[PDB]
Nucleic acid binder design. Sequence first.
DNA 1: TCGTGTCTGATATTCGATTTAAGGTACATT
DNA 2: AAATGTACCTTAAATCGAATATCAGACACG
Lengths: 183, 180
Amino acid sequence: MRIFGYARVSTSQQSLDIQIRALKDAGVKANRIFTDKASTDREGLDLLRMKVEEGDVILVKKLDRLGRDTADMIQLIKEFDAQGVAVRFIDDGISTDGDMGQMVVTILSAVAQAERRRILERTNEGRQEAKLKGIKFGRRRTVDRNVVLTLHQKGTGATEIAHQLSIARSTVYKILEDERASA
Amino acid sequence: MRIFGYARVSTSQQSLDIQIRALKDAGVKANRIFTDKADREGLDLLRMKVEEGDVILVKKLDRLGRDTADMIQLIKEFDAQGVAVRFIDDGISTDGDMGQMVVTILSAVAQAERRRILERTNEGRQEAKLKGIKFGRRRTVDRNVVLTLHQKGTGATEIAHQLSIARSTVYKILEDERAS
DNA sequence: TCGTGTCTGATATTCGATTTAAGGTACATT
DNA sequence: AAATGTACCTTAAATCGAATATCAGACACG
């Protein structure tokens, strides 16, 4: 019944020390904590993979701090559950053990195979070149592209369209470049 | 307590008929089944018809949304209406006992992948908090005026009407400067 | 001197979960 | 009836870094 913990960041040392301090207050010994930072340097996680034994429990601050994605996360959770090793996520109040633990691993296994079949879908038609994150980032497009394309198609010069729609001349070329690359 | 079901494919009509046949073997009426193909119109019609207490039968999880994020978004949207979803093959239900547990965990899964994208952002925010950078809204209210008037014995309602602020705002300001 | 392409850097948003400020309601009290 | 405190809940800005759009010129060439 050994207690372990894991913490992962990209760069920041402070937010890493935040997790470590949380694990230490959770009753995890200092030597029982493994960490990583960004090549794929997982050595802290790999060392945890080695040391863990049946009956051992691994404490993690949040779900996002485990895998590099949803797939990797469940892949890891399954890996520890196979060995009887339980994972408890502190802030989210979730565990792979106790009572609901099996239900936890069950639904986690469902979405895993579900998205794996979704990967099998995308792979056939093709997606990955696109790489959809799902969150909308950046300034919204306020410019009507259709008007720009139509005018230029009629032979209207670059500076004439820019003066027409009150955009920059460079903006016109960016629009023409984006739609040309699209075609 | 009406029974509904959903089936989704990309191209193949055969795999669609498989789901439909499976839904009908589960005791769903023929007019209670909605389908879509690569056009969410069938799913949108389902969103409209459903009411609190109704349950939806789906063959598998992957047959719901276009990705994991969309799926959880849908399930949350139905759970918000009290509508439940039971996946046949995966053996998972959003009602009864496990119901809260399903929504709770799927919420954590979704919020985790978003926080994964925000990793470098919210870490830089933690270093910013460390530097002492002030978060939250900036104070537009002069604290001196509020505290000076109150020192002379001006009532709370009067200061509020004076500076055109809220009454509870004055108390909160007095509380902050007293506690420190 | 002027218009056209190609290019880089500077502004401008917009995101999500969190964090403080302010507005607002509700209840009990004086 | 009116003003006074006290207790939480909604809006309302404001945060980081990354991502997307637009602006503003520079530079070379005919």
